[PDB]
Amino acid sequence: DRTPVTLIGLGPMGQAMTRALLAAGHPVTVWNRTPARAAGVVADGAVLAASPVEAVEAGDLVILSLTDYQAMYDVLEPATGSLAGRTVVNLSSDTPDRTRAAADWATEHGATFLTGGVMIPAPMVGTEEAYVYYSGPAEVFEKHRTTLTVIGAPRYLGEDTGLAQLMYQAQLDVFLTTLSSLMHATALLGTAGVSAAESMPELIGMLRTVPAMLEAGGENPGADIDADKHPGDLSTITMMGATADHIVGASETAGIDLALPRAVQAHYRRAIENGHGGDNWTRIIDGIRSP
Amino acid sequence: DRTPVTLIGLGPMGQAMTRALLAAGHPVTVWNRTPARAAGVVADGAVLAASPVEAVEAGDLVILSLTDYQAMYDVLEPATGSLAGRTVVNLSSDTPDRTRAAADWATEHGATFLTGGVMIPAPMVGTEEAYVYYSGPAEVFEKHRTTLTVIGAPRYLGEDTGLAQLMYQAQLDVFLTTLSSLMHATALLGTAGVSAAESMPELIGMLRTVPAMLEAGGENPGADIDADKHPGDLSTITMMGATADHIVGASETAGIDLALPRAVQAHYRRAIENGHGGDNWTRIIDGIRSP
Numbered sequence: 001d002r003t004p005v006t007l008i009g010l011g012p013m014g015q016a017m018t019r020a021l022l023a024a025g026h027p028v029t030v031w032n033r034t035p036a037r038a039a040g041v042v043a044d045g046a047v048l049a050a051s052p053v054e055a056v057e058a059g060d061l062v063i064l065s066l067t068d069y070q071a072m073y074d075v076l077e078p079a080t081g082s083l084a085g086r087t088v089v090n091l092s093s094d095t096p097d098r099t100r101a102a103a104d105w106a107t108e109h110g111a112t113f114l115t116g117g118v119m120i121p122a123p124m125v126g127t128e129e130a131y132v133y134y135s136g137p138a139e140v141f142e143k144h145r146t147t148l149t150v151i152g153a154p155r156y157l158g159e160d161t162g163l164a165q166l167m168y169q170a171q172l173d174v175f176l177t178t179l180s181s182l183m184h185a186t187a188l189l190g191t192a193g194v195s196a197a198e199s200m201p202e203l204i205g206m207l208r209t210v211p212a213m214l215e216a217g218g219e220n221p222g223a224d225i226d227a228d229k230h231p232g233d234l235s236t237i238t239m240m241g242a243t244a245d246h247i248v249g250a251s252e253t254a255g256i257d258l259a260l261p262r263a264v265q266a267h268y269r270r271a272i273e274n275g276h277g278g279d280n281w282t283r284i285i286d287g288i289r290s291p
Numbered sequence: 292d293r294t295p296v297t298l299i300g301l302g303p304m305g306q307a308m309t310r311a312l313l314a315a316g317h318p319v320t321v322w323n324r325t326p327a328r329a330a331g332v333v334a335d336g337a338v339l340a341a342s343p344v345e346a347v348e349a350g351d352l353v354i355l356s357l358t359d360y361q362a363m364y365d366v367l368e369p370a371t372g373s374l375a376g377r378t379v380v381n382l383s384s385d386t387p388d389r390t391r392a393a394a395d396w397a398t399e400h401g402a403t404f405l406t407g408g409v410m411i412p413a414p415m416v417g418t419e420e421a422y423v424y425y426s427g428p429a430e431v432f433e434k435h436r437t438t439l440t441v442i443g444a445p446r447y448l449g450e451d452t453g454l455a456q457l458m459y460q461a462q463l464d465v466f467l468t469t470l471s472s473l474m475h476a477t478a479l480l481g482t483a484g485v486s487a488a489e490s491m492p493e494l495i496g497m498l499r500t501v502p503a504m505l506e507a508g509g510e511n512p513g514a515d516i517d518a519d520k521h522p523g524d525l526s527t528i529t530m531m532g533a534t535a536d537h538i539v540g541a542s543e544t545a546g547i548d549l550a551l552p553r554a555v556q557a558h559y560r561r562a563i564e565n566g567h568g569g570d571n572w573t574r575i576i577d578g579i580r581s582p
């Protein structure tokens with residue numbers, strides 16, 4: 001395929017995605033707030049447009065890899081007159097509702113809009129491990145599918161432009177919270193003079209087992225949550241809530257951040273106050289859904 | 292080995308541990324606040340002691356599998372006169388300083404004390420996947436190591452009775468916080484009518500890759516944290532903090548718990564306020580260590 005592409009935003013992700021698209025035989029025209037940053041991808045065959053307008057006018061497909069959606073408006077507002085007849089593919093983090101309004105902004109300027117959420121770090125872009133969530137108009141996705149697939153295995157979720165964003169934010173909810181918990185635990189262990197080089201392999205070793213620890217003895221958390229079925233015979237909210245209390249207590253004594261473990265503690269407390277101490281830990285979702 | 296064992300506390304863990312010890316040829320005498328709960332392990336060859344005193348006097352080794360350390364005091368207070376010359380192995384969650392004081396309480400009553408933290412759910416007890424952290428007097432550990440290994444591969448951390456507890460609390464810090472994040476994300480996706488049966492495999496599928504997504508592009512977090520090395524070339528705190536902001540925003544709009552994502556958000560905010568927006572995410576540990 002030789003569809004000409006425009007890519008705006010040359011952080012690590014933009015640079016890797018440009019390279020992937022070049023390697024697959026696409027002309028790529030790039031633009032960046034900091035043009036010096038384009039030197040690498042220019043050496044690989046990208047063309048540096050001088051202006052956002054020139055960049056947009058060089059592609060059927062305009063991909064954004066920016067910190068947030070405000071950046072999309074910042075860069076494209078001077079170029080709105082050149083959007084008509086093109087597809088904007090925004091591969092940036094923001095809220096679902098910002099995303100939906102941006103889709104409408106695109107339409108108003110005569111363009112189509114696809115939402116994407118890239119689910120791997122830069123070095124994995126364009127590899128068999130890469131995958132990207134997409135939502136928006138099916139015909140628009142299908143038109144550009146072969147081009148986009150170069151970045152990573154596409155997972156089209158449906159018509160709502162906000163849905164791929166919601167999925168990205170949910171994934172990153174788990175990812176960033178997990179990472180914070182690793183740093184929290186590493187700090188906790190640090191207060192007895194355990195180094196991060198010692199603690200992090202222990203912690204990561206445990207994290208590796210989590211899918212299997214969740215499956216043990218025939219538990220199947222998702223379908224169980226859907227059924228309002230939370231049997232506590234292998235672990236109760238009382239018992240795991242006690243541990244959340246112990247983590248808070250240990251954290252208080254350690255002089256470290258209390259907000260993360262207290263949020264977890266609060267999940268258990270709500271379930272107990274609502275009379276479900278005997279239930280499995282999945283019951284915490286009720287109080288999370290309705291605070 | 293046929294060392295006689297006493298095990299107090301017959302939740303799922305106590306029952307599984309009793310079974311494992313029986314299968315390895317140990318006499319096990321059990322006691323429980325709710326004796327009816329012992330029926331299963333009695334059918335498998337355990338002897339139900341009538342009283343805590345009788346239970347303690349039947350074993351060289353007294354294992355506790357109780358919700359917290361207060362329970363240990365509740366059950367053993369009437370039996371304190373029978374502790375002398377025995378080893379108490381507490382496999383219960385509590386704070387490190389509660390644990391240390393408990394060790395001294397044991398010594399005062401003429402017993403030795405070992406701290407243990409069991410790192411797998413009940414169905415994995417006694418399997419090749421099982422492991423348990425231990426701390427306390429090395430000679431006491433070495434004496435009972437043969438018996439204890441039946442429950443799971445022992446990981447002795449040193450002399451401080453509080454250290455295996457600190458490690459358990461740190462592990463459960465990661466585990467419970469991760470679980471809370473899964474339910475948080477599942478709730479978030481629920482607000483667009485995505486079922487938990489759909490969302491949880493996606494989220495778990497991402498979590499599966501975390502031990503490897505952190506290694507992409509040659510990152511080695513632990514040693515790097517020890518070296519105060521936080522290069523931001525593949526991901527910055529500014530960019531990941533923006534995503535934390537987006538999760539909070541999405542969560543606010545979704546009507547779900549804000550405390551968990553705001554805790555994570557605050558980790559990023561502190562790093563930026565302290566002038567490290569350009570750094571890798573690991574830098575959040577500084578603000579966690581010193582709130």
Ligand SMILES: NC(=O)c1ccc[n+]([C@@H]2O[C@H](COP(=O)([O-])OP(=O)(O)OC[C@H]3O[C@@H](n4cnc5c(N)ncnc54)[C@H](OP(=O)(O)O)[C@@H]3O)[C@@H](O)[C@H]2O)c1
Pocket residue numbers: 009010011012013014032033034037065066067068070071072074075091092093118119120121122525526527530534
């Ligand atoms: N890094 C990852 O591992 C990863 C993984 C998947 C998804 N993502 C997402 O991918 C996107 C790109 O992230 P990244 O890590 O590659 O880079 P980043 O640090 O977010 O920077 C991306 C680009 O945004 C530009 N930018 C930011 N604010 C701007 C504004 N107001 N006006 C114009 N340009 C602006 C930067 O300009 P300058 O070059 O001039 O600074 C840069 O070119 C983000 O939305 C991120 O959440 C990242």
Ligand SMILES: NC(=O)c1ccc[n+]([C@@H]2O[C@H](COP(=O)([O-])OP(=O)(O)OC[C@H]3O[C@@H](n4cnc5c(N)ncnc54)[C@H](OP(=O)(O)O)[C@@H]3O)[C@@H](O)[C@H]2O)c1
Pocket residue numbers: 234235236239243299300301302303304305323324325328356357358359361362363365366382383384409410411412413
């Ligand atoms: N479940 C897991 O997957 C898991 C994995 C690793 C570690 N752990 C840890 O292992 C320990 C046991 O957990 P579990 O899930 O098997 O059981 P649990 O729900 O914590 O109950 C364990 C035992 O504690 C007893 N108990 C609680 N408070 C008591 C008190 N004040 N006086 C006397 N007995 C008291 C219960 O008595 P009754 O039988 O009369 O109610 C029961 O026998 C906990 O510390 C937990 O954190 C659990």
Ligand SMILES: COc1cccc2c1CCC(=O)C2
Pocket residue numbers: 118119120121172504505525526531
């Ligand atoms: C979806 O993957 C990411 C999103 C935001 C930041 C990061 C990633 C993956 C790799 C990493 O550690 C940094």
Ligand SMILES: COc1cccc2c1CCC(=O)C2
Pocket residue numbers: 213214234235240409410411412
């Ligand atoms: C150390 O493993 C646990 C501690 C407390 C609760 C649970 C576990 C692991 C298995 C599970 O789903 C529930």
